[PDB]
Design a binder for these strands. Sequence first.
RNA 1: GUAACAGGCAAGGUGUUGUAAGUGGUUGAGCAGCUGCCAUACUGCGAUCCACUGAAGCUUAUCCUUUGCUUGAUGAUUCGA
RNA 2: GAACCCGCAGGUACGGACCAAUGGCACAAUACUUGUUCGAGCGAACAGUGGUAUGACGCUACGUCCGUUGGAUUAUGCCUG
RNA 3: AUGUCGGCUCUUCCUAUCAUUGUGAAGCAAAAUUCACCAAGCGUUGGAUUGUUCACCCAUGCAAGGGAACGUGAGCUGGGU
RNA 4: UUAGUGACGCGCAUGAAUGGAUUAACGAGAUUCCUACUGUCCCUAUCUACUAUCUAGCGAAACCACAGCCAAGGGAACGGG
RNA 5: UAGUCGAUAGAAUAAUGUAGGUAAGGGAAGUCGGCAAAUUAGAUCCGUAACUUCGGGAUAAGGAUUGGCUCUGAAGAUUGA
RNA 6: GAACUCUAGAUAACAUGCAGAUCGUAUGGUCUUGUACCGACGACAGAUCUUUCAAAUGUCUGCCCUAUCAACUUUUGAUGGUA
RNA 7: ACCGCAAAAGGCUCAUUAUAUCAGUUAUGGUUCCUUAGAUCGUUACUUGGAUAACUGUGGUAAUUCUAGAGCUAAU
Lengths: 50, 130, 199
Amino acid sequence: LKFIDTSSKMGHGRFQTPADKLAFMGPLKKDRLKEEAAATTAAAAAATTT
Amino acid sequence: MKIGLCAFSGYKIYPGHGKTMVKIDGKSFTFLDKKCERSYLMKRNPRKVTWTVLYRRKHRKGIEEEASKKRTRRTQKFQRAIVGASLAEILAKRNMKPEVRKAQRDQAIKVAKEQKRAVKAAKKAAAPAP
Amino acid sequence: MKLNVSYPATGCQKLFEVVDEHKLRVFYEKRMGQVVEADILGDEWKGYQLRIAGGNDKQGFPMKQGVLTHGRVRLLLKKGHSCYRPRRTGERKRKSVRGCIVDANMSVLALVVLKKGEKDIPGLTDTTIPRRLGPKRASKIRKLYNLSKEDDVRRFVVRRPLPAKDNKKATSKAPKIQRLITPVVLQRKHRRIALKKKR
RNA sequence: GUAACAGGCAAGGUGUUGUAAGUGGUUGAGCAGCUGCCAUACUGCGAUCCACUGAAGCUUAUCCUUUGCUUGAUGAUUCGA
RNA sequence: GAACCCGCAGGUACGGACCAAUGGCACAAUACUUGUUCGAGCGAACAGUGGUAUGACGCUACGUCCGUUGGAUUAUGCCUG
RNA sequence: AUGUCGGCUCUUCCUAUCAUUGUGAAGCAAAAUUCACCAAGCGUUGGAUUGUUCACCCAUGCAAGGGAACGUGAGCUGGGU
RNA sequence: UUAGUGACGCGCAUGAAUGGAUUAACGAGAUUCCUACUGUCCCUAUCUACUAUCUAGCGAAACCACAGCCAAGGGAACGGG
RNA sequence: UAGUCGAUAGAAUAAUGUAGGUAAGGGAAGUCGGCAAAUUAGAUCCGUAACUUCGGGAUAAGGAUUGGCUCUGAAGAUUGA
RNA sequence: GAACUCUAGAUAACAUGCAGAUCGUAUGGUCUUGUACCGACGACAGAUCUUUCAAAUGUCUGCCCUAUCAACUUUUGAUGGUA
RNA sequence: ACCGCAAAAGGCUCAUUAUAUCAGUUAUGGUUCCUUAGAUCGUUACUUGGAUAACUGUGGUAAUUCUAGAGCUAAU
């Protein structure tokens, strides 16, 4: 066997793997937002301490 | 089975996955999937279709990896002696610094004066004889 | 495939044959100018870096830099470009041309080695397949030797002795130092200035 | 079986469509209307474009998933060697 | 001049499955668009699914996958007599 | 008052077997076809015209065998009659 | 191409206001060829709304000797008995 | 605006319907027969035959184009300077 | 046929070529002999100008048959103005 | 081999083509002209710079040919 079509049957599967999705799909409002929230929370923590 | 690229939406075409149309001429167009097929059959400009990687490049969305590659090459690989005087001898002539070079110059010019004056004088001597 | 790999630091080139697919595979989807580590290529080439200098395929229209297709493409080409040296003035030809990126269709890779690893391969490293000829012109003897206008050639020009073999008293050829600041040409400078003023 | 739970969500994955509202920009062929002691212009209108925005909406009822939320956990009849 | 059994690959016709791909359908899903209406706008409603492009859970094609092996013995060739 | 014919649709059987199986004949050398047998398990079609069975043609396939329930009008069509 | 059209016409049984011929325009008229078109078909499939269905309510009729399992046989020469 | 919302309803929304649609690729092969269905359709512009009773044929055939926004021109009335 | 931008210039501005880092003949004058200074011919460049080989367009006038071809060109230059 | 110049035509044929071509007649203040002939250039390296052929070596496709790659070296 040389390949398995792991793409979404949900219906018209572009991308086999969630890693292949990240390659084609560029900086979506998404994961980056979560990181941005975390940094904000740290700045808040730092202000309270000072 | 080779992962090709969708010639309108830039999306990778994993084994079988859709359809490839070959024109009469024959210009092969590769489609991931029906949505692409139908949009371009309907004659949409991919450049106004915000679903293509093609427009996204033009429209400056995302890129990063491709833009990092481009800049800086000078390149100077070697001196070129061998045959003329077997390497050491060219290396010897090459090295001998300006002060010694000016000596070689000037000595040769001094030797040359005598031959020029001699021939001018000799022709001046020769001319009376007829 | 076949690697025509050159150590051009000694001016050498040798031929090697890669039978094994995995070693071969390393080159796949690498472009002209791109850096390959040779340790995956071979046990002989540990620490060797390979620059893809060139290639020629089967069905061998020569690799032309930057047409990028792995297959082949038809191009209209012009004076003096890569894949185009035309015999006749304003000649334009359409050729098939193979493009720049290494794929399994490639008969011969042409590889310049960037770096000498840890191990001397004999035909590349040991034997010097030479550095052809000494500059000849007063001007290019100038910067190779770093003679800068005070310090003049005459006897610094490469004198090679060549016997004509049979049946010959071996001679040495000087040769011709062009644009020496030979007085004859100097006096022609004087003459050109002479004609301008007088007229 | 207060839990291998079950169900309704919200969340996340997965889809679908194709870039929301709102806001900012003379993006924008242009146009009105007032013109200085001098450069000059601005105030509105303007399909559409761009940025926020590969976004917003929609997602299976016959999707996938859940230490997230809350909630359910409390009816009837009949049968023998 | 045996496309002739061993052996091999495919298809046909028939039958039964299966929906992954590919194709078909429309969620009156999403977008767009016209006419009208909601002051305009957003977002919708009405044109008995408004039209149009795309179109999923799902169904289904023209799509694809699967269709066993002996005995008894006829015809018949035969033993022994 | 027992719903004409064909064609559409759909059934099962029968052989007096054209093809296919296994076979015996041949003035069958091969190829090919003809004859006959066990055999109806399995095929026997797509069209032009005709209302037409029948017929007549065209095309393919190794082969385009023939009959029975005047089949089949609360199945159609109503074309001929 | 048992169709049509132009011909031929000893025309079974054409024919001259018993009107004959030709014909523009017109026809929910009869007929033939080609094209565009399409689910007319190959070859089927899916979808909307309302039913059919099930349920609360409401509620007929046709028809009915007696009524209703087949096969063959005889018999008014085709039996549910 | 005025008048309705009563056409017994609910749940299911099966087959088969009815009434309304769509269907790749091929495109009438269908059938008695293009029946049913689809194509086509408005407007403006261009172009326009056979035949003809000169009126038509004619919307012949065959082609082009249509939104929105933003400008511009043309097309009227009346006194006044 | 001249308000020619004519072969050429002045005033005000412009851009960007030219002016040889050639070669072969043959070397002289003069030394403070730097290998100095300065020098003839014509080959090939070269810029302005003419000339020459040319050339493209434009004037005048002329061509067979045909009316069983009488109106033709202007859809989109047809024919004229202006730019 | 680079560089420069020729190859724009000799030659051939007369198809398209009927005022078109073309002859004679002429113009160019409506323009271009290598060349050749003749004349013209006094508004801080003076003889510098490095890259490529030919070359050398190694190659490609069945091929004419087209050239890839590596290393030299010239200029009117």
